[PDB]
Amino acid sequence: TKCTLKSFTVEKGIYQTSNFRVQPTESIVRFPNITNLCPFGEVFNATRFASVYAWNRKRISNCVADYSVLYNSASFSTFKCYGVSPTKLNDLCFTNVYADSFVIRGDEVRQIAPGQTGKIADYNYKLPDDFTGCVIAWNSNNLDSKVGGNYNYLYRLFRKSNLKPFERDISTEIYQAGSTPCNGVEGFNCYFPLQSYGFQPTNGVGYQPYRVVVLSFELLHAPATVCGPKKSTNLVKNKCVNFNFNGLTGTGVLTESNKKFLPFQQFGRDIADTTDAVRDPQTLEILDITPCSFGGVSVITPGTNTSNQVAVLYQDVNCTEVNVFQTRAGCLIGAEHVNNSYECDIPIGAGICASYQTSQSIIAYTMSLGAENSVAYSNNSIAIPTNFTISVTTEILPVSMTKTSVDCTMYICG
Amino acid sequence: DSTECSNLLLQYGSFCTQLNRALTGIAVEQDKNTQEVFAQVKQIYKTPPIKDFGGFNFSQILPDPSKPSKRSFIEDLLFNKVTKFNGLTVLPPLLTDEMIAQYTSALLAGTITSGWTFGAGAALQIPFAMQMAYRFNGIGVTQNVLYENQKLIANQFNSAIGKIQDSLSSTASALGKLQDVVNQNAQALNTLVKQLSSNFGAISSVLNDILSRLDPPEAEVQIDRLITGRLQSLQTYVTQQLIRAAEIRASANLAATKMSECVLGQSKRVDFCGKGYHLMSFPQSAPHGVVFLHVTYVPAQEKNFTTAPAICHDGKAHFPREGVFVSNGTHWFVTQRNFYEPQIITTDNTFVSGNCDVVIGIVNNTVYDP
Amino acid sequence: QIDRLITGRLQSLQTYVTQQLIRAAEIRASANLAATKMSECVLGQSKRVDFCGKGYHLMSFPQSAPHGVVFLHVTYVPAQEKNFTTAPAICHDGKAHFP
Amino acid sequence: DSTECSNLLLQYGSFCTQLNRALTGIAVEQDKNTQEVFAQVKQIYKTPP
Amino acid sequence: AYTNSFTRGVYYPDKVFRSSVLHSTQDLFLPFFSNVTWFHNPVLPFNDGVYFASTEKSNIIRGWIFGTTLDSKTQSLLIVNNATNVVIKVCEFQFCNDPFLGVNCTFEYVSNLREFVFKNIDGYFKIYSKHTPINLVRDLPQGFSALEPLVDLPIGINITRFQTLLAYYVGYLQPRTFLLKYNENGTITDAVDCALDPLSE
Numbered sequence A: 001t002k003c004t005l006k007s008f009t010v011e012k013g014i015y016q017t018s019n020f021r022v023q024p025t026e027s028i029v030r031f032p033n034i035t036n037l038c039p040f041g042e043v044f045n046a047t048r049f050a051s052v053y054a055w056n057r058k059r060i061s062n063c064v065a066d067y068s069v070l071y072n073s074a075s076f077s078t079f080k081c082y083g084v085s086p087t088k089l090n091d092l093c094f095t096n097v098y099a100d101s102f103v104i105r106g107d108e109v110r111q112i113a114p115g116q117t118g119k120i121a122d123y124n125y126k127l128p129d130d131f132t133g134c135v136i137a138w139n140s141n142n143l144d145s146k147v148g149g150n151y152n153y154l155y156r157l158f159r160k161s162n163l164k165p166f167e168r169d170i171s172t173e174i175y176q177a178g179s180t181p182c183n184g185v186e187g188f189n190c191y192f193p194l195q196s197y198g199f200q201p202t203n204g205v206g207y208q209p210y211r212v213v214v215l216s217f218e219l220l221h222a223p224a225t226v227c228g229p230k231k232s233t234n235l236v237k238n239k240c241v242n243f244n245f246n247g248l249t250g251t252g253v254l255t256e257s258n259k260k261f262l263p264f265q266q267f268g269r270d271i272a273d274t275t276d277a278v279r280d281p282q283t284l285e286i287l288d289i290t291p292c293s294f295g296g297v298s299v300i301t302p303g304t305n306t307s308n309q310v311a312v313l314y315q316d317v318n319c320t321e322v323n324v325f326q327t328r329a330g331c332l333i334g335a336e337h338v339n340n341s342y343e344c345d346i347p348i349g350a351g352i353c354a355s356y357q358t359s360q361s362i363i364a365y366t367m368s369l370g371a372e373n374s375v376a377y378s379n380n381s382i383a384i385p386t387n388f389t390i391s392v393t394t395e396i397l398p399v400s401m402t403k404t405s406v407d408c409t410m411y412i413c414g
Numbered sequence B: 001d002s003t004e005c006s007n008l009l010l011q012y013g014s015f016c017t018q019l020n021r022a023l024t025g026i027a028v029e030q031d032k033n034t035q036e037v038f039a040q041v042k043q044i045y046k047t048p049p050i051k052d053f054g055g056f057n058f059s060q061i062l063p064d065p066s067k068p069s070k071r072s073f074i075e076d077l078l079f080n081k082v083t084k085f086n087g088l089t090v091l092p093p094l095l096t097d098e099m100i101a102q103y104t105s106a107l108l109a110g111t112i113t114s115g116w117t118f119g120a121g122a123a124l125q126i127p128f129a130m131q132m133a134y135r136f137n138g139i140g141v142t143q144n145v146l147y148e149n150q151k152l153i154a155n156q157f158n159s160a161i162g163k164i165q166d167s168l169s170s171t172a173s174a175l176g177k178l179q180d181v182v183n184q185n186a187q188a189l190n191t192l193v194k195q196l197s198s199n200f201g202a203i204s205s206v207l208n209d210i211l212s213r214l215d216p217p218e219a220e221v222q223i224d225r226l227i228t229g230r231l232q233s234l235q236t237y238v239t240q241q242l243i244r245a246a247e248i249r250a251s252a253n254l255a256a257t258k259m260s261e262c263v264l265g266q267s268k269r270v271d272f273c274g275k276g277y278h279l280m281s282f283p284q285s286a287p288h289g290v291v292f293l294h295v296t297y298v299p300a301q302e303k304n305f306t307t308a309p310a311i312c313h314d315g316k317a318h319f320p321r322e323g324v325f326v327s328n329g330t331h332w333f334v335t336q337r338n339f340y341e342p343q344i345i346t347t348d349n350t351f352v353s354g355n356c357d358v359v360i361g362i363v364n365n366t367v368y369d370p
Numbered sequence C: 001q002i003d004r005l006i007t008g009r010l011q012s013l014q015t016y017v018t019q020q021l022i023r024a025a026e027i028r029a030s031a032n033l034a035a036t037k038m039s040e041c042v043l044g045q046s047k048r049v050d051f052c053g054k055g056y057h058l059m060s061f062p063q064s065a066p067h068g069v070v071f072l073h074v075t076y077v078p079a080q081e082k083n084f085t086t087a088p089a090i091c092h093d094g095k096a097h098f099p
Numbered sequence D: 001d002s003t004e005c006s007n008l009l010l011q012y013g014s015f016c017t018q019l020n021r022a023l024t025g026i027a028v029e030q031d032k033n034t035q036e037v038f039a040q041v042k043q044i045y046k047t048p049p
Numbered sequence E: 001a002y003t004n005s006f007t008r009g010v011y012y013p014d015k016v017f018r019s020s021v022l023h024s025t026q027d028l029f030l031p032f033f034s035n036v037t038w039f040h041n042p043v044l045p046f047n048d049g050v051y052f053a054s055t056e057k058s059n060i061i062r063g064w065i066f067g068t069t070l071d072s073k074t075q076s077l078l079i080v081n082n083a084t085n086v087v088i089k090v091c092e093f094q095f096c097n098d099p100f101l102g103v104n105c106t107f108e109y110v111s112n113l114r115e116f117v118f119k120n121i122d123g124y125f126k127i128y129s130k131h132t133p134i135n136l137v138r139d140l141p142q143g144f145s146a147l148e149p150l151v152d153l154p155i156g157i158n159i160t161r162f163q164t165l166l167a168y169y170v171g172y173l174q175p176r177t178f179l180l181k182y183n184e185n186g187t188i189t190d191a192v193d194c195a196l197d198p199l200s201e
């Protein structure tokens, strides 16, 4: 009180000095059931992979992409993301994701990266210089090698120009290495543009097959349908929490509700556009959100001249959530409840007044309206005065204020 | 519940503090208004078990001892006709409805059993018929009028109280004033709360969405827009409340004056206490208001008489002490002004002054000398 | 920067002026009341109840005071009293006599 | 007469409609003032010729 | 031909519960008592939303095409209920000159009076609907009923024109303000068009 009044002495009265507000004990986050998981499995776990010159592209859309399954896995030797962290991808939505899959040999994995040159980067698969996304690669000797040599995987050896980023060339046109047109006939300076990898299990690791998946992320002028898991936790009722339901967040106490939401309605609403109930996205139940108990903290004090003892009135709260007296105005602490009625000294409310009385203490009591009395009314009896008194009372009335005049320009723009 | 918003808000100084201070001043003023209107009696008088008030029947205004809060029938009718977690609270009034009812019962029982004496000093008992004789002498109607028409007067009063009951029970709009007040306040609050859903130029009305979506360097600008908007909303609300509280304070001073002069006494100010000559008033509680039942005397059936300003007896001019000369065509009488009660003219009805050559309209008659 | 400052200080000035206008309305109402009390209480003898103190008004004396006026209301208060029997009228010769 | 300005203005919510409400309240109050002051007589009396 | 749209085309503007509340909301609604084109497979515009209605005794009307060119040049929604199964596709379909049923895909899903509201806002294709029994042949019934949302497609295909796939009705939504009355159970039980007449204003 002394600070809130900016004084070292406090006159008798009841002052409001602060606000009581229950703090949230923990946090709860609730999102709908995690379903329609993105089909990364059919890319990473495909039995057969494409040749690099004919690299496959899988479009991932309208699904939940649990990137952890990828970045927590021990199955990958290369996992390199440019301009993005796969952990933060769990908090992001995209219009599309693209998984480009193929097979190369180990020494060529370095070519799957921005700003690289060589056979693969130039003629087979090219990333942009500003590539945003991930490159994942793992050895596939057990799957793509054969004792007699697996030649089913091909690479483009000749091309008239380098590929543009994400360009795909599957032509088998005879390459004209000289000035003589080939007309589709192979020969001198006329070569087939593709050649097979020779994948044998005894090859050096640089010549062994490696399966590669490139993840690209695309935002369009269209709804973003690929979103991260966004896991949820347990929900606790009947205690003040800070909550985050599907799209809304707030603080309050969640209680079993009374309302009948329609099958398509998620959020309740009061008349003054305040959230009133919510539908739990996982359990089809309606929870009332009663905001956590709060209210003013009034200090009831006699003049510091007389005493430094105070009582504290918490407005509109229970006596469980804070010589304690539960009044209609709130919960009053430090004030001794007495049965006797007195003249009101420090008004508290709802007919309760507090005062400092005798060894001395602060007491709270239902104020008295005055000594009760009866007039001995009868139909034939009158009371007449026989004497009198002359009484001088004093009525004080303000008449005028101080004539303050303020200079606007000097006050504002000194 | 936003630390960043509060940090931004602390730059505006004490706008918040003085808003709170203005509202606290309003609240204290409301408590003072109720106290000064009702708590005009130092003691709590109570009516005796006898209801022997000269034939007047007050059972519909006196407290019902087997009832909700010891309120009268009419008080209950009045109470049945008049009908959060965003930083807005409603403090309880210092005087509960039970205490207001006790105060009005004290005023009413004092009025019935003592008259105006309980307001001037100690309550001095007096029969109610004699009190009404006083109240009749207070409007220029001799008291014998009451004592000769006491039953008729009592029955008219009782019927008028019955009509008041019927009017309050049938028409709800009778309490429009009080209801209007309530409506206004509610609407104000609703408006205030709805102002939380506006953008005021920010990108979103939701403080948490701004905080969670934007980086602090720009979320700060957006929150500044929101803060200016909401602070202006609060200032508008508080100023409207101040002006409206001035309205209610003026009406509360008027109600206190009416209770002092109309209930605790007998006013003589025309149309201050209803149409007619004031006899008495009875206060009744009502939600956030008071209801005065004004009993007034209204002259009803009137007659045409010939009149004169004086009469000429022996050359002397006789004027009426208190009354007026009238004539039914043949004889002259001197009646009181407010009620036709004709009396023979005698030298103790009239006083002599001058002679018959000055008054314009003097007539001839004989003044009987007892 | 100066624009932010100017808006803030202009808003503060407007708030102060509005509060002063309302407060001056309060004081004007009280000054009208004091003028009425002087006219009817000092310059006369009011019969309005509780307007000029508890009791039956006799007179009043005005005293200046800093930014206000102080009325000393001299009033008459009945003090000692007795119970008596009472009657509205008395028969004498059959006729009723009222006081 | 500016659609863009109006769309910007309706971002403030009821900062305008309540001003209109207050002014209409004042106007109704003025009519009430005049009626209270003058209309204190139920009939229209007339002086004799 | 044309017909009166007495008080129909009102749909829950969102998924927010409200009870015993008069809520004022501005959205693309079918203006009350407006003209709705009445048909007994023409191509129609889709300016800014389409209220569609059908009265059936034999399940003649089957589906819809929405798009811009509808000729395998740009993606186009195809919504077909084939006899037990609802299929929604957004492939760049090649449609017939008169695509009737015998008397690059970016999304695919598979599951008397009927009212539908098809609108497209910010790439989302809101579909509201409401089914009811009826005994009437020549016109829409008079009365009030609110339309529940059924589908919210993230398609992203922008639509300009559309066509039905087989008596039905087409009305066009406008950006109007309505006063909606919610009873105790959260359902819209009455509405007022705020630009219909002075009393409604």
Ligand SMILES: *[C@@H]1O[C@H](CO)[C@@H](O[C@@H]2O[C@H](CO)[C@@H](O)[C@H](O)[C@H]2NC(C)=O)[C@H](O)[C@H]1NC(C)=O
Pocket: B051, B057, B058, B059, B060
């Ligand atoms: C005073 O008037 C009330 C009516 O206003 C009388 O109460 C009625 O009494 C009769 C007979 O007992 C009942 O049938 C009515 O229902 C009562 N009405 C109400 C409103 O209570 C009362 O009796 C009268 N006082 C006296 C002394 O007779």
Ligand SMILES: *[C@@H]1O[C@H](CO)[C@@H](O[C@@H]2O[C@H](CO)[C@@H](O)[C@H](O)[C@H]2NC(C)=O)[C@H](O)[C@H]1NC(C)=O
Pocket: B328, B329, B330, B331
């Ligand atoms: C005017 O009033 C007087 C007095 O009331 C009338 O004279 C009285 O008439 C009654 C008859 O109704 C007689 O019994 C009284 O003896 C009369 N009194 C006197 C003093 O003569 C008179 O008749 C009235 N005039 C008219 C025109 O009605």
Ligand SMILES: *[C@@H]1O[C@H](CO)[C@@H](O)[C@H](O)[C@H]1NC(C)=O
Pocket: A033, A282, A283, A284
């Ligand atoms: C959501 O999944 C949980 C299991 O994780 C299951 O118990 C619950 O019934 C599901 N909710 C719905 C609405 O299907």
Ligand SMILES: *[C@@H]1O[C@H](CO)[C@@H](O)[C@H](O)[C@H]1NC(C)=O
Pocket: A040, A041, A042, A044, A045, A069
């Ligand atoms: C691929 O298959 C392996 C089988 O060993 C499994 O552990 C892994 O989770 C699968 N991954 C995906 C993305 O399907």
Ligand SMILES: *[C@@H]1O[C@H](CO)[C@@H](O)[C@H](O)[C@H]1NC(C)=O
Pocket: A305, A306
């Ligand atoms: C209050 O305390 C002051 C000392 O600070 C003392 O001078 C004064 O007499 C005291 N008055 C009362 C009423 O206690």
Ligand SMILES: *[C@@H]1O[C@H](CO)[C@@H](O)[C@H](O)[C@H]1NC(C)=O
Pocket: A318, A319, A326
């Ligand atoms: C708070 O106190 C009231 C009585 O004053 C009681 O009805 C209520 O149950 C209490 N709160 C709780 C949580 O019990």
Ligand SMILES: *[C@@H]1O[C@H](CO)[C@@H](O)[C@H](O)[C@H]1NC(C)=O
Pocket: A337, A338, A339
């Ligand atoms: C007051 O009286 C009540 C009985 O009416 C009793 O229960 C209570 O203990 C008393 N309190 C004190 C402080 O004496």
Ligand SMILES: *[C@@H]1O[C@H](CO)[C@@H](O)[C@H](O)[C@H]1NC(C)=O
Pocket: A386, A387, A388, A389, C080
């Ligand atoms: C009246 O009261 C005064 C005291 O104010 C006293 O001195 C005087 O004797 C009293 N007179 C009678 C007759 O009681």
Ligand SMILES: *[C@@H]1O[C@H](CO)[C@@H](O)[C@H](O)[C@H]1NC(C)=O
Pocket: B302, B303, B304
């Ligand atoms: C009184 O007489 C006048 C004529 O002078 C007449 O107009 C009026 O109606 C009369 N009053 C009554 C109550 O009869």
Ligand SMILES: *[C@@H]1O[C@H](CO)[C@@H](O)[C@H](O)[C@H]1NC(C)=O
Pocket: B360, B361, B362
């Ligand atoms: C009343 O008016 C008549 C008509 O002119 C006149 O003769 C008479 O003298 C007047 N008397 C008085 C007293 O005014």
Ligand SMILES: *[C@@H]1O[C@H](CO)[C@@H](O)[C@H](O)[C@H]1NC(C)=O
Pocket: B312, B362, B363, B364
């Ligand atoms: C009244 O009588 C006197 C004589 O006593 C006479 O002179 C006078 O004219 C009369 N006046 C009237 C108005 O009749």
Ligand SMILES: *[C@@H]1O[C@H](CO)[C@@H](O)[C@H](O)[C@H]1NC(C)=O
Pocket: A376, A383, C081, C082, C083
């Ligand atoms: C009159 O008598 C009553 C008896 O009921 C008594 O209470 C009262 O005090 C008496 N008045 C005086 C002035 O003695």
Ligand SMILES: *[C@@H]1O[C@H](CO)[C@@H](O)[C@H](O)[C@H]1NC(C)=O
Pocket: E002, E003, E004, E005, E033, E034, E035
């Ligand atoms: C619909 O338009 C036609 C003219 O095209 C008009 O005659 C008719 O009145 C309109 N409908 C309504 C309900 O007004």
Ligand SMILES: *[C@@H]1O[C@H](CO)[C@@H](O)[C@H](O)[C@H]1NC(C)=O
Pocket: A260, E183, E184, E185
């Ligand atoms: C709301 O639904 C319940 C059944 O869940 C029903 O009993 C009640 O009548 C309905 N309310 C209205 C207003 O129709």
